[PDB]
Amino acid sequence: FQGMKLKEVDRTAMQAWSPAQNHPIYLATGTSAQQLDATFSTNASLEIFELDLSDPSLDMKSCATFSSSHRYHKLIWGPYKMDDVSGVLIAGGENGNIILYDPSKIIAGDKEVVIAQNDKHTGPVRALDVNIFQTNLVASGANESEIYIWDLNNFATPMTPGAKTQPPEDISCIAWNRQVQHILASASPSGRATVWDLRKNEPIIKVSDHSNRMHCSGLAWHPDVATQMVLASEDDRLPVIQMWDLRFASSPLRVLENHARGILAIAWSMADPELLLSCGKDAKILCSNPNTGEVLYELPTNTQWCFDIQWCPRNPAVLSAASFDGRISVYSIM
Amino acid sequence: QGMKLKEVDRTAMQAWSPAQNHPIYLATGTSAQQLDATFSTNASLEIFELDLSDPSLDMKSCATFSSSHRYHKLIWGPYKMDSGDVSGVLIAGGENGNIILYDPSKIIAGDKEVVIAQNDKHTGPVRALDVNIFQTNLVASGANESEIYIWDLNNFATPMTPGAKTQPPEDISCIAWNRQVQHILASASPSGRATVWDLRKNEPIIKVSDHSNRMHCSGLAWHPDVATQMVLASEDDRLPVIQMWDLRFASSPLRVLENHARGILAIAWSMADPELLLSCGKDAKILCSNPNTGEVLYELPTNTQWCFDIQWCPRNPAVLSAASFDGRISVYSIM
Amino acid sequence: QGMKLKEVDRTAMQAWSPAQNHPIYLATGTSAQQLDATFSTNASLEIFELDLSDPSLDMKSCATFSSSHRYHKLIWGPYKMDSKGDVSGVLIAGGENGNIILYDPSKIIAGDKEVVIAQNDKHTGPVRALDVNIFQTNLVASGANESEIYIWDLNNFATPMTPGAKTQPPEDISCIAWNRQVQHILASASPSGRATVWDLRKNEPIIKVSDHSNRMHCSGLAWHPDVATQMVLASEDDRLPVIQMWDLRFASSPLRVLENHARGILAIAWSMADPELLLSCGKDAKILCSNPNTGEVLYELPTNTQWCFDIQWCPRNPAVLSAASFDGRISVYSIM
Amino acid sequence: GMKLKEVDRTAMQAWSPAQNHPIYLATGTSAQQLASLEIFELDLSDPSLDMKSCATFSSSHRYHKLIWGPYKMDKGDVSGVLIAGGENGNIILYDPSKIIAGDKVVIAQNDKHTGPVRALDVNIFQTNLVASGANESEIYIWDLNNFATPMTPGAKTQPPEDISCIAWNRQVQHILASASPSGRATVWDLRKNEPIIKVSDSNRMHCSGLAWHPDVATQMVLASEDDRLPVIQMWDLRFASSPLRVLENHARGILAIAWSMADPELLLSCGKDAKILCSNPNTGEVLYELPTNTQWCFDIQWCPRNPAVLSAASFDGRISVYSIM
């Protein structure tokens, strides 16, 4: 349908676009954990590619490669680093590992690229998010309801948004509120979302609709409405995106079932909040309006499923989606 | 559809002769997991010739051997150190750590010296055994306390390991060599957690589990042509399923087959036609399912008795055998 | 006193896996230069494994990939862009109509559907000349028709560079070889036996050598593994069936001429482990081993009445070598 | 003597023609034992006894005879036609290039004949000519270029006898021989369309094979399956009154023979004594005994392309490929 494929990167990896203000546009990829191909290789690398739209080739220019001892569950690029290339690459590892990488030291080709490392978490660090008002704060999530808040000015000692939710469930997604800096949301695999108030240091609201049929695959806050957030489900018994308004806690405002099967990933545009990307087990990449519920268009894709999708921060027309067939594809909605 | 070709009154563990061997033989040994009303602990190893040219339901008994051990597992490897007119080794897993190697050609010949080797290196019942289809001299075994041993039939005295034993210690339910890459092994625990080992790296390279709270593992099989796909069966009635796993998306099962009313006792994935997976249920049903779609292809005709050691014939890909509750061994054809 | 260890029934271009790779593999690809005794239509990529523990003359076939290309050249490089895989390197294959293909030997051995990394057709004829730099293992030099020489970077294989302006007259590049001491030196040769030596820091040729015989047909080019300025040129012409030894410091004429074959030399392989060993196959159906520094024949490998178009030393096991003959057999031999 | 390949089939078999590459072995469900037609590829490059199965065609017929003619009227990658003799007078032509390709494969079919079609032979000179035999002295000459109506070699033998074998002369294209189960053979000249000579034994023969000498135009052998006379009779039509020599190397009846075209000094025979013997027909001497188990073989065939290779089909359900090296 709409738009087209610009670039393709054949890596089974976690992705992160460089922050909005950085030039050139960079795509960092970190070899994905809990997956194996027929080679049965656990070889991990963190690579950085440049996005050149002046070139019509499907190949991106590789800029740097770092031979990692970790495979990743999450990879984000925050706009703030404690000291050429803006920000910090924060990677969620296995066995509670959190690694901070200096992307300018990776680009340059230095030997020491790790800023700091930690293993305080238990199990896979699947959830990571940077606060947009206090760009030094990172919220992390792993097993047994572990939610840590790291200050990049003093990364050795973390904090908590309050006492751990009981019973202890894994934290699958984490997201800082886009309008009120001390509000954070966490989701569990059962679709129970918790909203923490860091001023009160305790949960202020808990919302769940199905639970019995929900399998959470995504959490996002509305870029411009403080009390509005979405929850995606991967479960084929309930293949929906629940659109919540925290003013009305009993049930979601609306439900989007635009896919034939469960939703594997979502990305809500900060540039244009009327645009919400979603990947399905029906192998469709859709763009839906979260305010109407309407499908605006479909992106041209193959028979493969995508586990991750992200809007490019510097270029709102661009997005990348990582598929299970070992490919990262870069599209334009233009 | 189905067609019963042969039947014999044996309460036993079974193993078909290797695919290259002619004629077809069905080796049986007294199960350590079933008693009769007599409470007899007497054990034997009986080998039958499958004669598909004889139209009777009877199967010719070639040889019997009096065993001191009852078995939890019985397999027949294609490779035997030094040659005999019958191919391979009979590898038996007994109680109290025992692994016994039997020479099938010496059993059939009818002589007294049939044991190639023996050892009690393992702890508890030796429930899990598998032979590597690429390096046929290599055997994986599992028992209690997370022990996995790798045996070379060319130097059977000292075992090797897939890597450091996983903690906390749990029994090894099943062991299966990968059907596409020779240094890859998978083992399963009673709760249904499968560990994938790289033998060349000497470490577990991935672990998979779903609904481990309600799972009781009764089977593990690698897909014959897809290196990253495997199935895990559950004996528990709270979750009577077959989990289809693709290691390329190892976070949860790709597909879950729920075609039985009660827990699955045994599975058998055809090497010849991977679109045929047999399963025995506690609902007194033998089903054939396509693991790539989940649908039931057909049910094999059986009575009210459970069946629990389903095995496809390596040489004739249309033939299979199932051991039953009432102490019978039935041979069927699918065509 | 060396002997035969293995034999495979293939009419193909061959390449051993790099020295760091364990186990030892022998990659073969259907030859575009030869025609099978049965005019066989099939084109395939087949990788065998070398196992000296087994006394059999039969090699274990690891993987087969039905190809849409026949090959004029096949090389196995130690470097590959993506980390994933136990099988190290890339198979770089030169084909017809200017095609260059990169295969992932790790994907082939695993038996994967798509095994191609990248592929282009910038060249204008058969890509019969290929070589990987041993100091910048991400660099490949290729050659084809009308003096075309491209330098590829496997890290960003999209655009090639040139060693300088195409040498006039525009002749076909029969061989290309990176210097085995200096990373920026490359030598190319035409079928006429005109060899051009390039320095990539200068982007111009530093020397052009020729015997000026008009009885030379270039079949091979190799740099001395220990001496920067030394290199050999082999001739397939039955009138002048020699291997010329050039020292580019004293380039008025060749330093010495190895005249051990009664008929044209078809192929050469200079051992990097033992630079005192030079293999040579001829139209006199002899595979000889000579000391290039003395011109002395050390040994003749026992062979049939059949000719070999390709001979290669095993990088991981220096004593082992393989020879591909026109009679559709690739034979693996030993020397110690 | 070395086993190369083994296939678990109780079937009639036919090797691909001499000019065809690769070497194929076609098999078809036997009607003389207790349905489908498969083509396997002989890959002597592979060390295992396992043969690569290319295609399987589900047929509604069982076969009494399966031959592979080198000529095809049509234009695929595989040479010739597979000609099968079935039950109830069936003669079926199959396209082997279409079987191999995966196509849905019958060129022509007819049930002109009465009873089992146990005798089939393709002429090596006029390769479009196929001779068949069934019950009641029926001999038909089929032309693959005009298959619809057959020809006869002349008037049906009286009293009527079923045709157990049929063989075209290997030196003269218009000469053909037919043999009844009693071992009474008739030679027909198709220029005259009449029998030219008849040869027979004592009433102890059960004919199991008829074969002409590849190099001598007047010589042919008749094999006997009956245990009362377990012999191969060497006939020379230069003296048609009594055999030239009798070959009695088996302790029991001969089930099948295969006379090498590449080397006519090599005649294969398998018996109920469970031996596969190679003999020089011109001296009656046993040159080699192919090593086997105690199982009988009902069909033996030399490989047209690789003269050192042969295949024998057993009653115990296995078709084995051997080397006489």
Side-chain angles (χ1 to χ4, degrees), chain A residues 2-7 9-60 62-82 85-104 106-109 113-118 121-143 145-156 158-163 166-199 202-205 209 214-293 295-301 303-324 326-334, chain B residues 2-8 10-19 21-40 42-52 55-59 61-84 86 88-111 114-120 122-144 146-154 156-157 159 161-199 202 204-206 208-212 214-257 259-284 286-334, chain C residues 2-6 10-19 21-37 39 43-52 54-57 59 61-79 81-82 85 87-106 108-112 115-121 123-158 160 162-165 167-201 203-213 216-258 260-275 277-285 287-328 330-334, chain D residues 1-32 34-42 46-49 51 53-57 61-71 73 76 78-97 99-103 105-111 113-135 137-148 150 152-183 185-190 193 195-197 199-202 204-247 249-264 266-274 276-284 286-288 290-292 296-323 325:
Chain A
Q2 255 278 287
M4 74 180 318
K5 211 185 264 198
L6 304 160
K7 309 287 156 176
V9 176
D10 267 86
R11 298 298 184 269
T12 311
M14 291 309 165
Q15 44 167 20
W17 286 108
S18 51
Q21 283 291 307
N22 201 73
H23 191 75
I25 299 184
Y26 290 128
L27 186 72
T29 72
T31 317
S32 176
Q34 194 68 11
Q35 56 83 6
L36 294 173
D37 66 314
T39 66
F40 286 102
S41 187
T42 56
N43 294 329
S45 62
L46 194 93
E47 284 169 77
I48 311 183
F49 301 95
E50 186 189 312
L51 177 76
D52 188 26
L53 294 184
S54 88
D55 194 317
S57 174
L58 285 167
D59 301 307
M60 275 169 88
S62 200
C63 303
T65 318
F66 173 73
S67 180
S68 181
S69 35
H70 310 281
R71 280 169 115 213
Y72 310 99
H73 284 279
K74 195 86 181 91
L75 182 66
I76 72 171
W77 200 327
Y80 173 68
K81 189 171 59 224
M82 200 162 178
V85 181
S86 65
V88 68
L89 269 175
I90 310 144
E94 295 182 279
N95 332 282
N97 273 295
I98 289 163
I99 338 293
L100 307 180
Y101 300 99
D102 200 310
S104 49
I106 304 162
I107 294 299
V113 307
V114 172
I115 288 158
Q117 189 162 2
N118 176 277
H121 268 306
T122 60
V125 185
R126 271 179 257 85
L128 283 177
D129 200 37
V130 198
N131 186 315
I132 64 169
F133 303 102
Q134 286 297 309
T135 53
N136 55 320
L137 307 175
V138 177
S140 59
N143 300 359
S145 303
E146 285 178 347
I147 305 165
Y148 293 125
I149 303 143
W150 311 89
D151 178 6
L152 297 159
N153 297 325
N154 185 40
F155 188 73
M159 67 163 272
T160 54
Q166 300 292 318
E169 260 197 289
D170 304 329
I171 300 294
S172 59
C173 341
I174 230 142
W176 286 106
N177 186 262
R178 291 297 190 227
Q179 293 290 307
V180 180
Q181 66 179 84
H182 15 248
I183 297 301
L184 180 71
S186 61
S188 48
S190 55
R192 298 160 217 171
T194 309
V195 187
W196 306 79
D197 192 334
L198 264 74
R199 278 172 303 198
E202 62 180 81
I204 49 107
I205 199 138
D209 192 48
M214 244 223 69
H215 181 216
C216 194
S217 62
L219 173 74
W221 286 102
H222 196 298
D224 293 286
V225 188
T227 62
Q228 276 175 15
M229 49 156 253
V230 291
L231 270 181
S233 177
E234 191 185 298
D235 212 302
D236 293 335
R237 290 178 303 168
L238 206 103
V240 305
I241 298 167
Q242 310 177 327
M243 165 64 161
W244 291 86
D245 198 313
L246 296 187
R247 294 181 283 104
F248 192 78
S250 34
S251 70
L253 169 71
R254 69 178 59 76
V255 176
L256 282 67
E257 182 166 3
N258 283 345
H259 289 270
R261 295 190 57 185
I263 294 89
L264 300 158
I266 65 168
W268 201 342
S269 186
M270 299 285 298
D272 192 350
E274 289 217 306
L275 321 172
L276 173 67
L277 298 174
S278 66
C279 311
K281 284 163 165 185
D282 56 342
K284 289 181 184 286
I285 297 187
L286 296 172
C287 192
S288 309
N289 189 331
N291 307 307
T292 66
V295 171
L296 306 175
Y297 49 90
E298 205 215 309
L299 277 177
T301 60
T303 310
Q304 204 52 253
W305 296 356
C306 297
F307 64 91
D308 192 47
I309 196 153
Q310 289 169 48
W311 281 105
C312 165
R314 190 165 177 86
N315 194 338
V318 174
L319 66 111
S320 57
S323 51
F324 283 123
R327 213 207 280 241
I328 295 175
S329 306
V330 180
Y331 302 93
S332 186
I333 58 174
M334 305 307 162
Chain B
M3 173 65 87
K4 200 183 274 170
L5 306 162
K6 306 287 161 167
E7 204 180 82
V8 76
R10 267 286 263 175
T11 310
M13 300 283 162
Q14 45 172 356
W16 290 100
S17 49
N21 199 79
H22 184 99
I24 317 298
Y25 291 115
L26 185 62
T28 67
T30 311
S31 173
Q33 304 170 182
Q34 43 203 307
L35 278 157
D36 66 355
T38 85
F39 278 100
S40 175
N42 300 328
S44 86
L45 205 57
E46 200 159 10
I47 313 191
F48 298 91
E49 190 190 311
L50 171 78
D51 201 336
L52 281 190
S56 80
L57 221 75
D58 294 337
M59 209 153 50
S61 178
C62 298
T64 306
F65 164 78
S66 274
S67 175
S68 35
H69 308 263
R70 273 159 64 236
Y71 320 112
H72 283 278
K73 197 70 200 273
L74 179 72
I75 65 163
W76 192 329
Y79 179 79
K80 189 177 74 196
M81 186 184 209
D82 307 295
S83 82
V86 194
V89 192
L90 276 164
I91 310 150
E95 289 156 280
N96 310 108
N98 291 301
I99 309 177
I100 320 90
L101 307 180
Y102 297 104
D103 190 315
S105 63
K106 282 174 136 289
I107 294 164
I108 297 302
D111 58 82
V114 301
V115 179
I116 291 156
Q118 193 181 184
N119 77 57
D120 48 60
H122 266 298
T123 194
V126 181
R127 309 178 171 283
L129 300 165
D130 199 34
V131 191
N132 189 305
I133 65 171
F134 310 101
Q135 293 169 282
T136 50
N137 59 296
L138 299 181
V139 192
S141 65
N144 295 351
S146 301
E147 308 157 328
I148 302 162
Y149 297 134
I150 314 301
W151 313 91
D152 182 343
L153 299 157
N154 293 323
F156 198 66
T161 54
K165 293 192 288 157
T166 57
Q167 300 291 327
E170 52 194 347
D171 295 357
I172 303 303
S173 288
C174 331
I175 220 135
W177 289 97
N178 189 275
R179 315 267 83 160
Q180 293 285 308
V181 190
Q182 49 179 257
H183 54 262
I184 304 295
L185 186 71
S187 65
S189 77
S191 64
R193 303 191 218 90
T195 305
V196 178
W197 307 83
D198 190 328
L199 269 278
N202 267 313
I205 50 166
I206 214 165
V208 292
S209 42
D210 209 21
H211 310 289
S212 78
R214 311 175 285 155
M215 179 110 171
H216 182 42
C217 193
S218 61
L220 164 86
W222 282 105
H223 188 297
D225 320 320
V226 189
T228 70
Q229 296 196 341
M230 71 174 94
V231 291
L232 283 151
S234 174
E235 196 165 359
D236 209 287
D237 292 23
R238 291 173 301 168
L239 188 95
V241 302
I242 295 154
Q243 285 171 358
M244 170 90 142
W245 292 93
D246 190 311
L247 297 184
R248 284 176 283 167
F249 4 106
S251 66
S252 77
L254 163 72
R255 185 164 295 106
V256 177
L257 292 70
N259 300 317
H260 290 278
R262 296 179 62 194
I264 296 128
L265 301 171
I267 57 142
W269 210 340
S270 180
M271 314 279 279
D273 206 322
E275 282 210 344
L276 316 173
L277 174 68
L278 291 162
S279 56
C280 301
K282 269 188 278 169
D283 60 347
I286 293 172
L287 293 179
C288 187
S289 299
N290 184 344
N292 311 278
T293 63
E295 98 286 72
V296 183
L297 307 171
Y298 48 86
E299 187 187 333
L300 221 50
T302 62
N303 58 3
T304 45
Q305 305 299 285
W306 296 349
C307 292
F308 41 76
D309 192 1
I310 200 123
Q311 269 167 90
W312 285 103
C313 174
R315 195 167 178 106
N316 196 323
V319 166
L320 64 111
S321 61
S324 51
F325 190 98
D326 61 341
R328 268 151 200 91
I329 297 172
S330 293
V331 181
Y332 308 92
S333 188
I334 56 163
Chain C
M3 82 137 177
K4 195 191 236 241
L5 319 144
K6 305 288 188 192
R10 297 268 275 131
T11 319
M13 294 301 144
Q14 50 155 4
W16 290 108
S17 57
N21 203 92
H22 183 63
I24 306 172
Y25 294 112
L26 179 70
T28 71
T30 316
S31 176
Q33 270 172 261
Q34 279 78 72
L35 208 58
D36 199 91
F39 301 100
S44 82
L45 218 63
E46 217 178 343
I47 305 169
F48 299 93
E49 196 207 310
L50 184 54
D51 173 42
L52 307 170
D54 186 40
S56 180
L57 280 96
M59 275 178 102
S61 185
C62 283
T64 325
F65 172 74
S66 183
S67 176
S68 24
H69 305 268
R70 258 156 159 244
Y71 314 102
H72 279 271
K73 186 88 172 171
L74 183 61
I75 56 163
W76 198 325
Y79 181 83
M81 206 181 148
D82 192 12
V87 203
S88 63
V90 176
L91 277 158
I92 312 108
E96 307 161 312
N97 305 311
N99 265 283
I100 292 175
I101 320 95
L102 313 177
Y103 298 106
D104 196 306
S106 207
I108 313 159
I109 280 150
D112 194 277
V115 301
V116 181
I117 292 162
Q119 176 188 349
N120 85 94
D121 56 43
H123 276 295
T124 49
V127 187
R128 56 229 324 171
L130 283 175
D131 205 40
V132 193
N133 196 301
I134 74 181
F135 309 96
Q136 296 262 254
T137 51
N138 57 298
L139 292 181
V140 200
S142 70
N145 285 11
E146 36 230 67
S147 303
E148 286 176 334
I149 302 152
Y150 297 137
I151 295 151
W152 310 88
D153 192 337
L154 302 167
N155 290 325
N156 251 79
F157 191 74
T162 57
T167 42
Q168 296 298 303
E171 233 196 310
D172 301 341
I173 306 299
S174 68
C175 350
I176 201 114
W178 287 102
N179 191 269
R180 297 178 149 154
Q181 283 297 314
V182 201
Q183 73 187 320
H184 49 263
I185 306 293
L186 177 90
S188 45
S190 63
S192 62
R194 281 189 275 280
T196 305
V197 176
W198 314 79
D199 176 347
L200 269 64
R201 303 175 296 164
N203 271 2
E204 47 138 275
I206 53 165
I207 203 161
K208 289 171 195 139
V209 285
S210 194
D211 55 0
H212 292 87
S213 71
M216 156 76 166
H217 184 231
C218 199
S219 57
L221 171 72
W223 283 108
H224 193 305
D226 299 351
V227 183
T229 63
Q230 270 171 63
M231 64 168 195
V232 289
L233 286 157
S235 185
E236 198 219 284
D237 203 308
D238 281 12
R239 293 177 234 114
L240 181 109
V242 307
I243 306 174
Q244 316 185 311
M245 175 77 129
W246 296 92
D247 199 324
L248 300 173
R249 287 177 265 151
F250 317 103
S252 58
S253 68
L255 219 65
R256 75 187 70 82
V257 177
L258 277 64
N260 304 316
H261 293 268
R263 284 186 66 185
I265 291 103
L266 294 159
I268 58 162
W270 205 331
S271 169
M272 291 191 61
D274 210 323
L277 307 174
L278 181 87
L279 300 172
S280 51
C281 323
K283 287 190 216 171
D284 54 357
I287 299 185
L288 301 175
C289 189
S290 300
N291 190 319
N293 303 324
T294 73
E296 184 197 79
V297 186
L298 314 163
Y299 181 84
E300 180 186 322
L301 273 93
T303 46
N304 317 269
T305 181
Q306 301 303 311
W307 298 350
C308 301
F309 56 87
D310 191 81
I311 188 117
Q312 264 170 73
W313 282 112
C314 174
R316 188 165 174 87
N317 190 338
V320 175
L321 58 113
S322 53
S325 39
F326 291 99
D327 74 320
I330 301 156
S331 290
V332 171
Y333 310 95
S334 212
Chain D
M2 188 165 197
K3 196 189 254 168
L4 308 170
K5 301 293 166 175
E6 197 169 73
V7 122
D8 234 21
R9 293 297 181 276
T10 176
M12 289 321 284
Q13 53 163 351
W15 285 113
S16 49
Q19 75 279 27
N20 195 77
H21 190 66
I23 296 170
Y24 291 108
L25 184 74
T27 80
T29 304
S30 173
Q32 287 167 212
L34 278 197
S36 89
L37 168 84
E38 297 175 55
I39 305 180
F40 297 98
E41 188 184 335
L42 178 82
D46 203 54
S48 67
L49 277 70
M51 200 135 84
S53 187
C54 305
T56 300
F57 177 65
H61 288 102
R62 279 170 109 222
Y63 310 109
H64 276 280
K65 196 66 186 275
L66 179 64
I67 65 176
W68 197 333
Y71 180 82
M73 191 188 165
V78 191
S79 311
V81 196
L82 274 168
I83 317 155
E87 314 193 68
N88 302 290
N90 287 289
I91 302 173
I92 317 151
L93 305 184
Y94 294 102
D95 206 301
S97 60
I99 290 159
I100 285 294
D103 187 84
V105 291
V106 178
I107 299 155
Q109 192 161 325
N110 83 80
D111 70 308
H113 269 305
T114 307
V117 185
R118 309 203 319 295
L120 297 167
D121 206 42
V122 174
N123 191 310
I124 71 183
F125 312 96
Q126 301 163 269
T127 50
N128 54 301
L129 303 184
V130 183
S132 66
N135 305 156
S137 299
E138 284 187 303
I139 303 163
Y140 293 133
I141 316 299
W142 303 95
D143 170 11
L144 298 173
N145 295 303
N146 312 80
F147 196 69
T152 44
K156 279 171 184 178
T157 299
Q158 229 83 194
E161 284 178 288
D162 304 351
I163 312 300
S164 54
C165 344
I166 209 106
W168 291 103
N169 191 273
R170 287 170 172 166
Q171 288 290 315
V172 184
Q173 78 185 358
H174 54 270
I175 300 308
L176 174 75
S178 60
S180 71
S182 65
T186 303
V187 176
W188 313 82
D189 185 342
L190 278 78
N193 284 289
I196 47 171
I197 213 129
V199 290
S200 47
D201 147 65
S202 90
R204 284 179 305 154
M205 181 149 306
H206 192 280
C207 184
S208 55
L210 176 69
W212 288 100
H213 195 299
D215 290 354
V216 177
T218 57
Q219 282 176 9
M220 35 144 288
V221 291
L222 280 162
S224 179
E225 231 172 307
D226 202 293
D227 285 346
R228 295 169 288 151
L229 190 58
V231 308
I232 295 159
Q233 293 179 328
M234 170 89 153
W235 288 95
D236 201 322
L237 302 180
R238 268 178 280 153
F239 192 72
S241 315
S242 54
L244 184 68
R245 77 181 53 88
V246 177
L247 278 76
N249 298 319
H250 294 263
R252 286 184 71 188
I254 289 104
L255 295 161
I257 62 181
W259 207 334
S260 193
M261 291 297 280
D263 185 14
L266 310 170
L267 173 76
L268 281 174
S269 61
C270 28
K272 295 164 160 174
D273 56 344
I276 296 178
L277 294 178
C278 194
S279 314
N280 184 338
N282 292 114
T283 65
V286 178
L287 310 150
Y288 196 84
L290 178 80
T292 73
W296 301 354
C297 284
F298 61 91
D299 191 14
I300 195 134
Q301 276 162 69
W302 284 104
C303 176
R305 194 168 167 95
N306 198 322
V309 166
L310 66 111
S311 61
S314 274
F315 289 106
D316 70 10
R318 56 192 182 155
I319 294 168
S320 307
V321 182
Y322 299 91
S323 184
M325 295 298 284

